[model samples]
Target chain A: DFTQMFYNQNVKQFWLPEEIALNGDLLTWKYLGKNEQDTYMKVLAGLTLLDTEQGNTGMPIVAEHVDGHQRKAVLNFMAMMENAVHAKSYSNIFMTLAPTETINEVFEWVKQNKYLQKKAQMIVGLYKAIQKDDEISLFKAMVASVYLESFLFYSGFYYPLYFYGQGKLMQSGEIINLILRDEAIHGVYVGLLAQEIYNKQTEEKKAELREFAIDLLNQLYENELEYTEDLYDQVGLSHDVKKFIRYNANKALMNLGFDPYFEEEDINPIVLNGLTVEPLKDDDFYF
Target chain B: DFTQMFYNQNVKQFWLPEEIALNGDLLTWKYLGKNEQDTYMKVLAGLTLLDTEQGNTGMPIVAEHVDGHQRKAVLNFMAMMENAVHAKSYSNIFMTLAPTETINEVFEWVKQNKYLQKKAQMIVGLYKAIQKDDEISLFKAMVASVYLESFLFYSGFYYPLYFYGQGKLMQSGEIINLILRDEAIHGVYVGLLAQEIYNKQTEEKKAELREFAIDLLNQLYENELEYTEDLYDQVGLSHDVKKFIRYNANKALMNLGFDPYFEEEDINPIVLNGLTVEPLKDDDFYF
Candidate 1:
């Protein structure tokens, strides 16, 4: 029944126009020739394919929501839309802002993300299929999805935003913003799931998931760093992006009830990319 | 001349799909009523419009890249392809995946991201405007761009990946995977930019920008979180989303070189929708 919910015709696919904005000429024209670049684009293309796959599978949930199966599932679907809006925004940004070299670099990074995305897919499927009703295992997998949705994906998404802000690359920045918005929804959705589990969790359950979360963050950090290094080989920036990664990772850990990896003294005050940001206003004004 | 570069044929006005996506049917069908959901959609529409604005402006930079700028103003027309790709992908996800109630919520998130994308716009603009002598400021902005690219945006992105990956809603999981791949490149671009600046910076210069970056990351983290909360309130994910935000904010802080804001522990695990992810090597081989 859950599976059947997605196939109905009433469900329409959500679309971000920026994706279509980039014509085939550009895909083949700009970053197509080189080995690494092609690999990168392949990854980008893979993401597109993944989008379709998600679309095909997710329809049922929306249909169910329309029919009102579980009230929460509808909210989850709302979060999913937010994620899609922003993700496609990033794609459009790539077309409009990133340089040829950077686009090529992005392509490779996409390959890496695709790998991670697939990995997340596997963990979730395994937990459900193999582990079955093992709440502990299922919970672990749920937490893993939260991590990917929250922690593992930011590095690559942020790159082009810098370029576009400077007017050197605007489209890419816009697209990134779109994708970033979606990611935020993703973070909260999964985080909410994790929190629910954590809320009702026994101390032992909390301990287990926390340990699991910590381990995954560690591995994710490495994977992200490695991916960054690889991207650097293609097109480098002028500042230390690692500092940003480290700082943000620390912040993420803070939320997870863990100590930071590095010393407080090690915390760099400067964001690596270097532009100034506006300050936050009162909390009430935030919404 | 600076203005002229911006005024060139390549730069076009941007338009987000919310208004267009909603179309007449959507306008009349449901969400047009002034409810929280409608407000959320308006916010999302605003965000998309901002993306359109940014993307429209970003084209010249790519142009400069293809047809090298004789003056200092850099252009990157090729990058437009990347933006187009991402935007379309996201839009696709939206059409196929987002729910009626949360459509507005998703839209609101997009608006927030649009504001953040402006930072990237500034970075790109500053990069092109730089005189060889203005390296410090340029790098500073680039650093800022990197931070924005990595953290400000990715949280939004990971949201969709999890939704589709899970068997919950529409079929966007696969597409989100692809989008995530693109996002990885975007982050890597910023990271490379940051690294370059760091590598080249004098200790004094690095120190000068360090504080600015640190301050900015904090603002970015909280700003994003608050916006997310507002959006969440509109569509409302489970409380677990907060943990996801904290985790991501910590990760962003860590990535940028700060202590984790929420967690007391060291590099915790990476989570996806709250599940922990294993490294890529175990049960599957994709390389």
Candidate 2:
């Protein structure tokens, strides 16, 4: 039923990056404060790396081991495509808004950034461990996917959502919202997979998975805080962004059928507004 | 560049099984002879297993090992979705044309059919071999995927195609054409991946791969002949169907950048006609 649900939902929501016009954001982009532009590109650049990994590397690895069930496999494939689309949407945003040199610079920033690299390496390492099939390794890989989907993305997501909520860059925010809707379902479905795999594990292995998750989440959350500080500190939104990260992280945990890593706290209402969709009465925005 | 080209093409050609109306097929179904109906169901029944396996098992396994390029990953994801859609279209056809009991029985037929089981086992074995990363195993897996996309499905594809060419089962044939279009691309893209991987191999491994493909195709073709004999003898199309199979197998080899094992021959032109589409003059068919 979950597979059918996920598959049907994907069919209903099938979309192309080209369908959403970002020309509006391109013009609006130039009017933004310098730090706002800086924060937006950096956050997306970092987010792009995770989506690249998820779409390109991580889901395929999880998919190989989850080969027994056709339903799970189909769901994972849907997730895989959604991740790739999310990656492309970011590139589209950059192509429309930034010069080639600026795009290259953001990628270079991604390469040199320590916390980002560490996060990438850690997640990629977990997926690689599943190269040899064992329940423990496979479970770890599934959890790692959830980590990437639920917790890891929020720091980068915060910038776009924040700006969008404030009635700025709504086009780019619409893309982010699409990606979030995808990730939201991805998190729940894959988390359900993680929960199923974990539930089937031996008691000892289950405990080890829990311990691994706690340590990994703790370390990754610390890295996210550092990355957020680097990107948002100058923009003066680090506190709000971190609050949003914790809020999504807890949602991720709940989706995974695990206890929340932190107590629920209200995400800034303005940031929450970025998640809602408004009907356009005219084409005035893009033109 | 091929990956980007294929990705863009996939975006342009994206489709859903639900969007197509099978009611036309249901009306068409009652006019066919019992053997025609029998062959139609059996052909699709076999094709369903392959699509289900490829979408669920084969592609995911290969995708896990193909972690090198972001573009390649996107192509594989598209292939994965197309395979899933192909499988769903078969189910949609079955749901429209058969009773629930008949559908259940056909699945049981899939489970018990020895040739189908052997085919699934052989393909899945190659995929599982690549679970441990090695050039030989991965190359074999990629070749196997090409075989599935190009060769294995042709016997099954031949039926709906033949009937559609005769203006019977036109609706189901339309679905098959969409699937065949997707498969045509999937086979070429994956075969290119196989060729690239093969080209990178040591000369000795390349020679071995060529040998492996020859023997594998020989054995699989032999098995398919027996399957066709079983399925088509009753309908008296065994020889014609075998010709179609060999034609496709040759195409598969060429797609993999190898010399054909069988002499190239023209397929029955009737089957070829199934691949073309005519502009609709009116909307009466669906209603």
Candidate 3:
């Protein structure tokens, strides 16, 4: 009975996370020069910051809404819960660069604001648990999750990647590479889910919800930029926080299928100055 | 802040579900020939039943109380909303099974008994949400979750597995395979968590809680068996539901670190009879 193989075919059919290219190149980080190392670390930190922020906000709401079949697949919930574990673990990593006191404060802020990310989850859970067909609202909320995962996260990864481009922190760039890889997967998750929601709704409904989502995203970025500026200032950042925030918002807008919301000129000079990689928005950047 | 190397390093270490082997074989069954196939549809049905029941009852409470990391990491609250999403997915899987009328009724009964599972998630979520210290009640709630996951759930997985062994179905095994694999992780979550709690409590307090956990396992199992048996009988099961209940209960007891609490000789012969393979047990097989 224990080895019972019902749905063996379906189990076979179910998608498993596949292995992609992982070469010895990944192990060659030590030889990279310091600027690259710095950029890499910045990338990793920036990307992880997104994950760190998202999962920290996501898990508690998940814990709340989970029941029944979802709870049965407890591993999924556990996996998300582990995200919190991963986020908390960043403190240990952050301490390696910044002062332990500052790192602790960073997490203290994480602790305080942990409750803010519950909006999407709360809305989604309420509708889903009741098995309502409120596709527009659910789609809106879910797309926000996608926007959060994709747009909100990448800006942070680029922050560090810029330094790595200058060969200032290559090791850090390697770390960011890994964070990017994970975010890529998360992007897949949010993207696919968003598509699923879009498909479930009509073209008109999809467009309406997409517009709603983009607007919500813009609002979230406004708040996020405000928070980031406050946080960076608290950490004694020298670069113009407003510029950095706008650059991030600009990047987020482009990736999320909206018109560029932040002005390039308004973006900090340091951010514009650090543009070693071709603009992601340019056709030349695409493979 | 976005370029923090510490954050970068943490995000790069993500793990996949397929990467972890639960020492279970649903994955293998996918490649098996028809002649060699084992019936497991009921196992899936059982898993579905469990998930279906739990979603409606237990999860909302998890959302309500999972603790934050002080004032920071608060952004994680959004991910908590994923729990609600996870619950719905399980339900989707259950609906796909087209559960037997009997199984459907059984599912409904358990769903109505919402308090047990709801309380269970509350306990489990509390543990998963908060860190080791924070609030003592929250910590205790976490311990209670471990207790429920390990003991309460352990006892419940076998009835459907037994049905599969009787040649009652095929998909049952596949579903159980996924469900069992998940349960093992859940158990580990509880067990690992119990260790954490034990490390913190005084020797006497630890001993008391340890015993409390074990006792709860027994109580939960006994009641679960009774309710399960009733569900089976209400659906007009051909087997002696009570005896099958005991057999599964004994299996769960052993998993939860307790002596077998039921008579072995009285085990349902139909389930044990003509089972072709000697299934793998972890301690004996893995080590």
Candidate 4:
């Protein structure tokens, strides 16, 4: 049921980043407050690293161990869209909007950022278990896929949507919305696959997986808070973003069929607006 | 350097099989001789399984163990295009040209066909080793990828191109050409990757891979010959298709930076004609 549905939806959702007009965003980018600009570039840079790894390692590694053709087909599509399409889309926005020097620095920051590296390492560490090829590791890898898809991306995604919600960078937000749509389904699909992997586990192994994920999520959330503090603290948005993180963390858990990790809280109205950016009026604008 | 170049090229080459007009082929399919029709469906059914495995298992499995982001990115793109696009394109063709009853039987034939199963199992067997995290197995998997991309696809591809060259089933031929173009680059990219993996191995291990590949190629070609006989014997095209297979097998070897396994032979003039099907105008006609 899911295999055909996911495949059909993905095919219908086929898009090229080039179809989006970043020129308008380039104009909006100039008037942003310094803190906002810095936050925007840094957030995407961090997200790029996460996306880069997800495409590069996460999907392929996890999908390799999956058994069915339909399932494998869907995961493979997600891998390309995430790694190749999403990664390139970010580069499209950056190259069009920022100077080459700034783009270079953002990537350097991606490499050097303490929290970003920790987040990446934490997720990749789970995939390494898959490389070793055991049931427990495979389960961990799927859960880690959830973590990366559901939790890690939201921090980076929040900024564009936030700005879009404010009617600031709607063009960039448009692109992010496309990315988010893909990621949302990706999260659900992998979450379901992860749940399947979990169901087959011995009770002892399930307990172990459940414990590992709880501890890992806690540690990663703390690290993301620190990272958010660095990016958004100067602008006075860190606390709100932290709330958003917890809210999304709960969503991530629920996606995996686990209970919410935190009590539900309303997301910022602006971020919610950002997620609902209007489609382009000119369908022929893609070329 | 080549990784980014390949990624860019692949993006530029992005197409949906749905974009091609297989409806024209649906009309033409009825007038085909029974043997031609049977050969067409059987050939694609066989190709579908090969592509299904490549997308599902081959590219993702090999790309998983690869260490570089850019390399993994390219492989991930190939995985989706092969599994999602290429594999589904065949379905598009099958559904358009044949009944549900025949499509079902074709798939069953694909399963029970001795040679097709051998071809799939042989390539997948190497990938299974990578799943087990064996280093030498990784090397063999790279070679196997080159084989699937360069050699295994040609026998199945020949029929549509042949018929199209004769100015029959031109629409289906167009789809095959698109698939062929993608496969050609895939062959080169994986071949280069195989060489890179080969360069990293010890002289002793390199010799083992070389000998192993030659023996495997010889065996697989023999199997393919038997399979071709079963499909084309009544139609009297088995000899011609065998010649095309040798022509491609030599190309496959050279792509891997190895000496040709087969003596040089010209492909049939008709098959060469099939390779040159004209491009479709108003490309969006697929929708």
Q: What is the C-alpha RMSD of each candidate to the true structure, in Å?
A: 28.1, 11.3, 15.2, 10.5
Model 2 stretches with alpha carbons more than 4 Å out:
A131-133, A201-212, A276-287, B31-34, B66-70, B131-137, B197-210, B259-269, B276-287
Interface RMSD of each: 18.3, 9.1, 12.7, 9.3
TM-score of chain A of each: 0.59, 0.91, 0.53, 0.92
Tens digit of per-residue lDDT, candidate 4, span A86-148: 987888888887899989988897799899999999898888777454766777788888888
Q: For candidate 3 chain A, which ten residues in a row score worst on lDDT?
A: A1-10
lDDT of 4 by residue, B1-287 (tens): 58889988887888888788778766678987898889889999888998998888788877778777678778888888888899888889888888899999999888788888888888899887774556667778888888888888888888888888889999889989999999999999988877887888889988988998898888888888998899888778898889888889888899899987677677778878887212245865977
**DockQ of all candidates, in order?**
0.01, 0.20, 0.08, 0.38
True contacts kept of each: 0.00, 0.29, 0.07, 0.79
Tens-place lDDT per residue, model 1, B1-287, is 23233323222322222222222223222422344434334433433443343333332222222221221111222133223434554555455435766666665555456544554454455545544445555555545544544455444544443333343322333444543443334444434444555667788877767776667666666566665665555545524455555665565445444456676433213225412986777557643
lDDT of candidate 1 over A27-51, digit per residue (tens): 4335434644433443343334333
Flag clash pairs in model 4: B19-B286
lDDT of 1 at A255: 43
| lDDT, candidate 3, A1-287, per-residue tens | 21112112212322211121223334445465555444434433444445543454442333233333333233233234335444433433454455566455544544455323443343334334433355555445445555655556544554554545555444444454444444444444434444555776677876786677666766666665654553344334424554555565554444444567766655444433444111134676688
Q: Could you give the candidate ranking by DockQ, starting with the highest?
A: 4, 2, 3, 1
At residue A178, what lDDT does model 3 achieve? 48
Identify the candidate with maximal TM-score.
2
- Candidate 4 is scored at a TM of 0.84
lDDT at position B200, candidate 3: 73
- DockQ of predicted candidate 4: 0.38
Q: Is candidate 1 or candidate 2 better by DockQ?
A: 2
Model 3 residue B147 CA deviation in Å: 5.6
lDDT of 1: 0.44
Worst 10 residues of 2 chain B by lDDT: B275-284
